[PDB]
Amino acid sequence: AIAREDGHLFSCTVQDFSDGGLGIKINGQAQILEGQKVNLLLKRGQQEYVFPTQVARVMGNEVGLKLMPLTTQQHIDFVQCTFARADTWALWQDSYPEDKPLESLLDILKLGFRGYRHLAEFAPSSVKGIFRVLTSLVSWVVSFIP
Amino acid sequence: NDIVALKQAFSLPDIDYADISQREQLAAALKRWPLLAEFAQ
Amino acid sequence: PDIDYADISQREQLAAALKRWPLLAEFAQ
Amino acid sequence: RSDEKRILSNVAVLEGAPPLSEHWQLFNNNEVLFNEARTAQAATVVFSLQQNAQIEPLARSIHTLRRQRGSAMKILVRENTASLRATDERLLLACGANMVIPWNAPLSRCLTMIESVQGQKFSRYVPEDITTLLSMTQPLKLRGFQKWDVFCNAVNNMMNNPLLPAHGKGVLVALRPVPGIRVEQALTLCRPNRTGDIMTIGGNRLVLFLSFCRINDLDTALNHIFPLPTGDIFSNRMVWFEDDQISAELVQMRLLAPEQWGMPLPRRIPEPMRLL
Amino acid sequence: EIQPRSDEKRILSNVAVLEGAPPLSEHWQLFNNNEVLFNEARTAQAATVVFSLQQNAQIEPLARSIHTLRRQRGSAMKILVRENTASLRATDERLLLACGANMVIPWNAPLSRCLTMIESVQGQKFSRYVPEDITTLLSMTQPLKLRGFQKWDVFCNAVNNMMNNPLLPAHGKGVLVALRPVPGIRVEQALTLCRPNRTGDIMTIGGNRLVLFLSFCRINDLDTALNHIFPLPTGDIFSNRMVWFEDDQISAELVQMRLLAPEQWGMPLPLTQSSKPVINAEHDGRHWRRIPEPMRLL
Amino acid sequence: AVLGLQGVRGGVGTTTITAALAWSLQMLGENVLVVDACPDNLLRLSFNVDFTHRQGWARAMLDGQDWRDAGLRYTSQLDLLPFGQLSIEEQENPQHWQTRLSDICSGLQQLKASGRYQWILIDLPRDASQITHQLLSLCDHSLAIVNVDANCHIRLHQQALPDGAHILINNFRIGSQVQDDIYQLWLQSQRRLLPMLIHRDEAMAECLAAKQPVGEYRSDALAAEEILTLANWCLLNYSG
Amino acid sequence: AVLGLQGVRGGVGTTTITAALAWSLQMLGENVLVVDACPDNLLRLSFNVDFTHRQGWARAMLDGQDWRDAGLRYTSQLDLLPFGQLSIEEQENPQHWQTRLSDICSGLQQLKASGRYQWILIDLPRDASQITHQLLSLCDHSLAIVNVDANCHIRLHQQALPDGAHILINNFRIGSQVQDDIYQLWLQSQRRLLPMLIHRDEAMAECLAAKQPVGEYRSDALAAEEILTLANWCLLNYSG
Amino acid sequence: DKLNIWILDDGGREEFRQFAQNVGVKYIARTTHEHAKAGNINNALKYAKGEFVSIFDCDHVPTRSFLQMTMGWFLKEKQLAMMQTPHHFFSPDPFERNLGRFRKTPNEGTLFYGLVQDGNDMWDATFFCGSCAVIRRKPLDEIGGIAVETVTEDAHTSLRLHRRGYTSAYMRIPQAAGLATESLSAHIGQRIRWARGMVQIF
Ligand SMILES: Nc1nc2c(ncn2[C@@H]2O[C@@H]3COP(=O)(O)O[C@H]4[C@@H](O)[C@H](n5cnc6c(=O)[nH]c(N)nc65)O[C@@H]4COP(=O)(O)O[C@H]3[C@H]2O)c(=O)[nH]1
Ligand SMILES: Nc1nc2c(ncn2[C@@H]2O[C@@H]3COP(=O)(O)O[C@H]4[C@@H](O)[C@H](n5cnc6c(=O)[nH]c(N)nc65)O[C@@H]4COP(=O)(O)O[C@H]3[C@H]2O)c(=O)[nH]1
Ligand SMILES: Nc1nc2c(ncn2[C@@H]2O[C@@H]3COP(=O)(O)O[C@H]4[C@@H](O)[C@H](n5cnc6c(=O)[nH]c(N)nc65)O[C@@H]4COP(=O)(O)O[C@H]3[C@H]2O)c(=O)[nH]1
Ligand SMILES: Nc1nc2c(ncn2[C@@H]2O[C@@H]3COP(=O)(O)O[C@H]4[C@@H](O)[C@H](n5cnc6c(=O)[nH]c(N)nc65)O[C@@H]4COP(=O)(O)O[C@H]3[C@H]2O)c(=O)[nH]1
Ligand SMILES: Nc1ncnc2c1ncn2[C@@H]1O[C@H](COP(=O)(O)OP(=O)(O)OP(=O)(O)O)[C@@H](O)[C@H]1O
Ligand SMILES: Nc1ncnc2c1ncn2[C@@H]1O[C@H](COP(=O)(O)OP(=O)(O)OP(=O)(O)O)[C@@H](O)[C@H]1O
Ligand SMILES: [Mg+2]
Ligand SMILES: [Mg+2]
């Protein structure tokens, strides 16, 4: 939830967090502007914590927040509500997609093609430039003719 | 609900979680406010 | 109680407040 | 030298507290204090600001004191009630005041601040002409809605003024209204209160310039200006408060052709029923 | 003279000084704490350095850093300390000013007044004298170093030694107050009802009169100290008071006190006698709470 | 089901929460009748009823008329039954009419048995009168409205909540240390505490000034969403 | 002399304001007696009285004892007369004892005529009981406590304040638009409104949890200063 | 009462000293900088007085359940002398960052800390991996502290503990997350150091 200085509260969904900011999504862009101070309400279980924030970006539903200088207790609470949660990393590892050898081969082939295209722009030894451009040219021509 | 998420994710049905931070905060609160201390004990 | 709603429309801020909130306007008529 | 320890102060500086030391003299108003400080050389003069109207005569007195008497004298202005702006404080500092003590600081903080200025000399330059200092209080003298060209000219003239603080001349704000309301309706819901605040509309944007407003205290000014909360009326906000940024935005606003500009335009009721 | 002043407009401030506001100009450089800021300021010559104070534990290291900056980078520099929430006593502010700080900004002043005070010090040269030895300044911050009841002899000697210390503010050393108890209760009983909190607070009993010396206490805030070290309602335990807050007055009163005969001096009641409180009040830790007692309305 | 909302003390937000809950229930498709039992007669104003409208069930029964004529149709899925205006003499002499309002209990029972209204919300005072006890007995379930403060902490230890009533927290504030301490104590000591709490939101303060429920006045407010959560909880748990 | 503080609505802060005003008046040198007329009996807990102390003037009168032995001394210039803890059965049926508490009027008359007490603050409830009417009748002056919100704005137009009562504002917020509108309307319309108001302060929220008056709990707090200003106003105006 | 947090600084930086003073945790800044991290930990052990020592890297943030999920086995097996916890990286690794597959492909090190250490657990060969671990101080004092010979000191001290008869354990739940290498060069360098240490141990 987000708290404004006039006393209006609106719900939001935190989508990403960092050391000094958060990213939230609001269904309809209730009330926020790109410099306003906002109190951010985070819940760890049944306990709610308040953190002062400043709005950095508003792009419709998505809003970027910047954390204000926090005290030590606020730092501890923020870490306990964002980083030191005993559910983020386990679910992160459990959300990894399984292994599909054929899709993996296709991805690695695309990665090699992307690397060749990357080297088709810069070249340490100038001569290699022409050869790399030729390889990329023929490769994408073939890709267009699968 | 982090511990609940862990229990739902990877077994752990018999590990009773001792939230010592909540207990310490509650003890400090009981020390700070005599009304709460009077009603609790 | 002592309520004096006479000459209540002669101020701009009070007029705006009465326009915003129907309850205050309803009481002030 | 001789009266360095002496502290000539107004009565209202101490909220009833007794003279804290032997070196304290209490005066009724900042006129007898001025006359007594004229004879002083290195004393500490603590004025008092009760109401707004006192700023100009107090500035004149501070100017005369810092001119006739050198850099040894310490001049402090203790503000007792919220009767001062940032521009007025800058004027008082320019006229020769060591520092202005805010009303937020209680008596003990004020006494520590008085101890702070001891042994210090006023090395800043105080101009001989006083009118050129008072002219810097409000240089715009133009309120309300202005057309695009007039707005840009006024702001550009303010930016080019050499006798104004750098990066502290004002704030230029561009407001993009939420869909469903035009810019003319936003202009109607816009009532600037000060003399140096101007507004304009062009290209589905409402552009404000608040004179001498600081970037931090922008939401307060906007809340004063608009009747509804700022956030239910506008979707995005762009702010320029540095001189280079404001100048760049102005020169990017002049390349807006007309016909893209703007001018001001000249509940459920329950019904009775029988329950059954 | 540090002749070159090329960074006369550069503002090196702790990130906490700007309470989330964007840097006002291109001249503002922000730092995370007051140790990176000190490292960068060791190379400046005329910049404004704004420190942020949030705890009392970081006053001595901040004092040392300010002392080093002032004794090495000359007088052209401008050192400001911005107290954020609450961290300072008057003595700590005096120590910071004596170490080399131009101005300490109280937490009561909001951000805008803080910025105006920052700009107020521009172009000014620190012309005060900063001693080479920091230990003397650190010792000035607490010159009594004994708390609680003291004998009439020890009390008089300690107060006189404090008043004879030249490295202390004139007419700002403390308040000497003599309290005459309410006729219903005696003076040892009044001694039992006083619980000094700070190290430099002392008291003694003699001649039906309780005298207190509160170190570095101003006259205008004597009632706050008395309310802190006595059941809040002063006047239910003392009848009248005599206050001395000037060096000459305190010295004369000490001279008068020294003439009291030793037979009229007091001693604390034995701990066995500390069974029934003198009045209806209990000292649960560091606070006085008055316990209601039964009575009959007339 | 018939749900009665009562507060441990005045000023907790029982009328505002009643109006918001009725609006959220009618928003989910449930027919709702909202009944005001508080003599102050302030629930009618949240549904854009004029102040001068003195008609109500209590005034109907105190004039010899029929109390069914006093109902109001706010939406097709929401009907309102105001208490009715009482004169100053009647307000200052509550003993001359509090025993004459007993006829409402049988009517409310027959309304419950009719089946037209899937929910009958009652706004109850805490005057310890006969009518309050009778109507609270008519309630299938009840909610106790409290704020997290010392007053409610004392009251919960010295006064009897309705049998089976759950505790609903209103006016949950921001940055109150004592509130956090009391809430921590309640999370362990109180077993009837609901898992959802209403916050101190300006929308709730403004809704009565606009003579609308908070959901109608401002659907993006956090209070409206929390009242919707309460309505879902009531559907899942107070169905029968 | 006798100053009765009554709230236009429950939860406005009558008890805490009464305790703070008593503390400030006794700090100004006045002998003060506080009488808790509210049956909930919460005023005693602001003066460090144990929750298990059931005695009071009302309990003494119900049990047949003497109410003069139910007084508590806090300071030399502040005395407290608690209501006393009533049983659950007594709370459920208030009509069994509301008519048995008449001698308190004569007792307060005797205390007023005695001259021992310069101020007798009475914390009155809002229940339209006979005892509250009698206590208001014996009160020389009245203070009506309101919050700046829609509820109190409506109530000031439909319920009768005690004659000669002055309205006191509590729980005043910062940056609330509807509150500002109502406050300006009251300044231009309410003739009985006092020039002083009390802002929402965490000190007033923590004082009851610390079982102390706000002046004793935190004398530097803004609410304490406002209560001191109100006490000075009462001394200058309500003395005679 | 039974948790002491120490900040060990080999740079003698005053900012860390002030931060430790402000937050209330311990601080040690040794005068002689020898044996690098192993020597720092040994000097810290010379002052710390606790039954268990848990080593955390600077970028690894523990969850609040770490000690409760870890300490159970130390009270069940008296011979246990080392417990290991997975290394998780919320920062994108050079592969994930450059190749654009961050949450799609698993991390480079999640095969090791997800399957290989769990396999080593059966054969009692779960070696110390630097961070996210607990070592009983009584066994660790017998071996003379953290081994200082190789550049991979954790594996060496775990090998010594296993050669003195003490066992080891592994817990699968990720309870600490750190920062991945910021570039391909950093990954190459850290792998080179690990390989050099392992060949030195061999
Ligand atoms: N352009 C512009 N900027 C605005 C306006 N209102 C506020 N600000 C900005 O916001 C700052 C804070 O003003 P405040 O909070 O109202 O606090 C104000 C207020 O309490 C008082 N004050 C200043 N001028 C007036 C005035 O004309 N009337 C009243 N009643 N108070 C004033 O002095 C305080 C300090 O104000 P400043 O130092 O000037 O600093 C002002 C200014 O930078 C506005 O209408 N236009
Ligand atoms: N809260 C608040 N309100 C603000 C502020 N700035 C302007 N206003 C409002 O705008 C009105 C007109 O101010 P103005 O056009 O600058 O014209 C002003 C200005 O020239 C002067 N004035 C009043 N107070 C101050 C002050 O503190 N400093 C200065 N420099 N001028 C002041 O008196 C004129 C009339 O002022 P008012 O009668 O007070 O009426 C003021 C006040 O209600 C602000 O910062 N805060
Ligand atoms: N000898 C003595 N003097 C006392 C005592 N209590 C108050 N004073 C005097 O009263 C002044 C105001 O203190 P305050 O109103 O409590 O307001 C205080 C308080 O909020 C805070 N403060 C200062 N020292 C401490 C401390 O050790 N602990 C806490 N918690 N706050 C402190 O700083 C404010 C300013 O205090 P100072 O600058 O020291 O100035 C103090 C001091 O001169 C006491 O027990 N002994
Ligand atoms: N409100 C208030 N209370 C006062 C004041 N002076 C003393 N006290 C009380 O006295 C207690 C003991 O302070 P101390 O012995 O000087 O020992 C103090 C002191 O050495 C230090 N401290 C805390 N705040 C400050 C501060 O602002 N300045 C300085 N120099 N030291 C401080 O922390 C120690 C513990 O202080 P606390 O835990 O807060 O507990 C403090 C506080 O409750 C005052 O001016 N105002
Ligand atoms: N969650 C909330 N946030 C902010 N204000 C609220 C909230 N809930 C209620 N209020 C406000 O509290 C005031 C009183 O609440 P309400 O009108 O519901 O009275 P009540 O306590 O239920 O009944 P009564 O006052 O008759 O005892 C109103 O002005 C209302 O707008
Ligand atoms: N100005 C204030 N700021 C903050 N909290 C306040 C303020 N005034 C009162 N409170 C808090 O409001 C709560 C209830 O107030 P109080 O008990 O005085 O009201 P009341 O009118 O006596 O209620 P009741 O109807 O239960 O007798 C308490 O927790 C109190 O601390
Ligand atoms: Mg109601
Ligand atoms: Mg009450």
Author numbering:
A (entry chain A): 708 to 853
B (entry chain V): 20 to 60
C (entry chain R): 32 to 60
D (entry chain E): 222 to 487, 506 to 515
E (entry chain U): 218 to 515
F (entry chain Q), G (entry chain W): 2 to 241
H (entry chain A): 304 to 505
Original authors' sentences:
Bacterial cellulosic polymers constitute a prevalent class of biofilm matrix exopolysaccharides that are synthesized by several types of bacterial cellulose secretion (Bcs) systems, which include conserved cyclic diguanylate (c-di-GMP)-dependent cellulose synthase modules together with diverse accessory subunits. In E. coli, the biogenesis of phosphoethanolamine (pEtN)-modified cellulose relies on the BcsRQABEFG macrocomplex, encompassing inner-membrane and cytosolic subunits, and an outer membrane porin, BcsC.
Importantly, whereas one of the BcsR protomers is solvent-exposed and features an unresolved N-terminal domain, the other BcsR copy also interacts with the back of the BcsA catalytic module. Contrary to the crystallized states where BcsRNTD can adopt a β-hairpin conformation that threads onto the surface of dimeric BcsQ, here residues D21-S30 fold into an N-proximal α-helix (αN) that U-turns into an extended linker before adopting the V-shaped C-terminal domain onto the BcsQ dimer interface. The BcsAPilZ domain orientation is further stabilized by interactions between the β4–β5 connecting loop of the PilZ barrel and N-proximal residues from BcsR-αC1, as well as by an extensive interface with the underlying BcsQ protomer (682 Å buried with a free energy gain of −4.1 kcal/mol). On the other side of the β-barrel, an intercalated c-di-GMP dimer is found coordinated between the arginines from the canonical R696RxxR motif in the N-proximal PilZ domain linker, the active site gating loop is unstructured, and the active site is substrate-accessible. In the c-di-GMP-saturated macrocomplex, one BcsEGGDEF* copy adopts an overall interaction interface consistent with the previously reported crystallized states and contacts BcsAGT via its REC* module. The second BcsEGGDEF*, on the other hand, positions above the BcsQ dimer interface and is further stabilized by the β-strand connecting loops at the bottom of the BcsAPilZ domain barrel.
